[PDB]
Amino acid sequence: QPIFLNVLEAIEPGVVCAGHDNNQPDSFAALLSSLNELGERQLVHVVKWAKALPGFRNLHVDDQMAVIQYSWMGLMVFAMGWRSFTNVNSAMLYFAPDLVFNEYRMHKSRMYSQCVRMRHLSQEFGWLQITPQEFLCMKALLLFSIIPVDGLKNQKFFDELRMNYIKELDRIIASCSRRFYQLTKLLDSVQPIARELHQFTFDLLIKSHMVSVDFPEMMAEIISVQVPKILSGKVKPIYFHT
């Protein structure tokens, strides 16, 4: 109904496959190399999606790029949690049609706790009965949910944009605004997951040669250049709740 929702529905990325070889045995190396490839492929989609959001061109160019490079983990985790919810009713992690994690794969990836964290998020979409429209608004807000403590190049354009995406989430909600407590709480719950995954992928990149885990070009650069800004505390999520 809003022009806003029209736009979010129209630009929502479609299916992305990982290219995983489902004939080879599950192995840390094969599973994580396919996750890394998936990330690279999804990142192409996230860029094209983000550039198409209402107001996104408002930002300075370096701020457009920064915000994508900080927020892609949260975004992709949130969208994967939704895929899992809608395809397999949260029973397994639907990273892609050719890379669905069962318990066994959760274990083999050496990321079990984190997977459980993500399956939990996924169950939340069920337990809270989140709508497609709430989902799209919430995902758009995650793009604007992590920034350098010292601010962006043009911080005022970012603030205005984030303020308006909050207003939009509020509009598709509008005792009732207990929903807002919960949706904001659910949004916050993405961040600690993303942080754990940021530490995991960082350590994995450092030790990648020794474990034959393959990182694609743009993933290696981003995980070595931007991700450490997060881990070092230079760049931090915006939480709703303290």
Partner: peptide
């Protein structure tokens, strides 16, 4: 960066 090349 490969990212900035992709972006711009």
């Amino acid at each position: 960066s490969a990212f900035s090349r992709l972006y711009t």
